[PDB]
Amino acid sequence: EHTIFTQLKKNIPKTRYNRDYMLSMANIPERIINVGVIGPLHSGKTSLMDLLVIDSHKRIPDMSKNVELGWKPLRYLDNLKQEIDRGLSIKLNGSTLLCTDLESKSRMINFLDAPGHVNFMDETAVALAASDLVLIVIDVVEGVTFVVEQLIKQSIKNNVAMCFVINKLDRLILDLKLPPMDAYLKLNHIIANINSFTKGNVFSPIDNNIIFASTKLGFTFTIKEFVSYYYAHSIPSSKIDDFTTRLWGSVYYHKGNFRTKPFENVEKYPTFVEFILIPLYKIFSYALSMEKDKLKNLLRSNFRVNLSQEALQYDPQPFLKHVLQLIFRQQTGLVDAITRCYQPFELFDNKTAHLSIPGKSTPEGTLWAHVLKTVDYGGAEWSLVRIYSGLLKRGDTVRILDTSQSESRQKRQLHDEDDETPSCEVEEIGLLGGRYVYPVHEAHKGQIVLIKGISSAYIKSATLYSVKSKEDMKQLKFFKPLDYITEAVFKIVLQPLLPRELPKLLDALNKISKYYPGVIIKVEESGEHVILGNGELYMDCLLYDLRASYAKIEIKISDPLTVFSESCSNESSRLGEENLPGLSISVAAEPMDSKMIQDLSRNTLGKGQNCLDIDGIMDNPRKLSKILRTEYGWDSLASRNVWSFYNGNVLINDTLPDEISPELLSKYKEQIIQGFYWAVKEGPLAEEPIYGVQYKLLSISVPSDVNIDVMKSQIIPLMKKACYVGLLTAIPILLEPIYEVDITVHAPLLPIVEELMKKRRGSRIYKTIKVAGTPLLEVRGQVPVIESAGFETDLRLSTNGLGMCQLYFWHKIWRKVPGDVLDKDAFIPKLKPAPINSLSRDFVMKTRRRKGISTGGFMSNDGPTLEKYISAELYAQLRENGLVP
């Protein structure tokens, strides 16, 4: 009902190697490497794992007669039942394989294919943190689309090597029917398009960074593999390394000598066309058309390849796959690219310094591992872990710290004792194997394994350490919470259909928050349950497992919603006051700069090869005042008195008692900021987060007498009340998230897409790229997330299947909702979409009634108003001037 999975040990498929020699290679850290397979939607990633699994194993019981032939793929690493039905990877999966390169050096390689759909961009952030090098699989037709660009930008960010797989070369000949020079210009266009995004490293088929593949026909090759099979016999052995460099890149060959210019009097192609593409297209042509007796002689004469008597009575697609698998014999050129690209001396210290804090290398006595995610792998709850130091055996006891706690634990590690971390026992260790788990007694350094018995100690990620001495605990590093790229911004509110089934819902929602790491599950004060998701497909995959796999209950579910953010348009006798006169705190608000907001969304503050990350942004206050004054042009006083950057927001101390007694403020500073955190999390308008508001603490009053006990506990609710008075006075607005859209349609069907973008509300097409060589073109635009309900299927039905869009939230575009948020006279029509001037009033009033903050009979409007916080006698004074409505 959930997966397909071989439970029996005796039915696990045997391998060509003996699998104990593979685990013997786990002892050497340099021997083993971790490559994770990423790419766009339907790029051929799981099919690339089909080629690596069935050539590692001798007989797979799940492979059928249609699958042994060409007709249907073995999506072996799509073991989930929903993944079989969707035709789609959903969960991260992997298989550990022993693989030899072109120099026949066998080594243990841990593969992990990420799902390529853009709503599962949380699963590939696990694959970016696990892997030493990413094997980015690109289809040749769509080329370098905008989701390819981010997968190049993320791999540079994660300090991870990369190696590009150009896939689907059958579509380049069988679908598109390009002439061989016209397809060489296609391949040269894509490689020149990935070299602009890899800002340092040049990528080229000479440099063994690029592998050509057509995975439905089941082959892959570099140009180094192809020379070493069929051209190394003819030319001298000192020439094979210089010949393969004269192979790509506008250099021509005729009768024994090479030129950059074209030969006169001779119709001649480049050396890549004549030596590789012309031999490849003849294999495509002759396996489909040439007689099987005449073709059998050409495969012995040129490829030394014997066609079987059973293979000649094949259908044209299995016969084309059988020839292309009997040429291009193994994936030794893929593995040689994975071997030659990864350099652990350059990258593994920077990769560890990016997942945790930068420091010296931990000693080998420390066991130290990174728990990537919790995996529901084969009817059990496993933990996906990567070991960075030490040795872990089955039955040991380890200290497992949840990563959300690791911000404070790393900060409290400095110290200018006991009960620090819960302890769980390593119940069982296995290797992920696709449709099975292979049990192992221990797990060495550098390899991804699956451990049962860890998952209860944490949510959504963990760090695993087992330290020997207390002095050795001082130097261990804690990992940072995982950078899932897309923010969970697509919102669904649910409750169970029956009230007595609520504990079974809360049990299943705690599983989904573990299993789906890019979700944000929260419980409102009204008792409803909010799930924040990535898209329509990410919610539909989530709510399948919630209704079928993890709780058998039926649940009520609202329409798609979004998260809103709160902000202001201008800066604004401004004071705040408690019923007791002992506390008087005045707070002003101001919009932050657009460049200052856009850089804090990129998680780092700076410009031009000088930037300060948000984690150590307090630890250099002299340098922070240099960055704020130079790059954005703030005042010198405002640069020195900034207290904290909470998410998208800033607090500045601007008061005269700070010039009088800053030490009296410094003992109360940590709880003003704690109360500042208590106000940004739920703002004054609709209990929504605050984004892009420059707070200025104007004044603060300290009562006669001091109580740490009472003054400490009273200022935290009052500062949250005082931040509301500053924002509401400062012409508040409502923000909405903006999906970016990546449409692929055929070129005649573009005016359908332009009219389809006009039916939505805040949609605009910004860029229209002619995807070269293809009939289709790439359309890049934007849409609000509250408007993008059924956007994906309105596009497909209107273009009759020749259109597809990816909706994503990489860039954190928050845009002002077009209405005015304080409109008592806004016309909200029932059952119809309200007009464009009524939008900020509508979205707040409905949100305040989901939360229960505003309670009406049917529709009673008590707006977010500046009178329940400030005194009512002052509110009447604000009406007569025209400042407050």
Partner: protein
């Protein structure tokens, strides 16, 4: 040839190399080349007359080596099979 290929299999594996000068270097293998010159880490060195020392890193020219001892497990290494 297979014998050198096997040396690549040795890589990262505690291996013992006897020089034609008579010494014995047992330790981990950092790198190897088709020439066969081998460089080791944490080698325990035995001079020809038996005096034993310990050296952090080492490189030995291929021509010098008389024989190499490699991990016993390597024997069932995948490449070896004739067919």
């Amino acid at each position: 040839g297979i014998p050198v290929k096997l040396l690549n299999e040795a890589q990262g594996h505690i291996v013992s190399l006897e020089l034609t000068t008579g010494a014995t270097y047992r330790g981990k293998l950092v790198e190897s080349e088709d020439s066969m010159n081998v460089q080791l880490r944490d080698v325990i060195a035995t001079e020809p007359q038996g005096a034993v020392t310990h050296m952090d890193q080492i490189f030995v020219r291929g021509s010098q080596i008389k024989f190499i001892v490699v991990p016993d497990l390597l024997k069932n290494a995948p490449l070896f099979k004739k067919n």
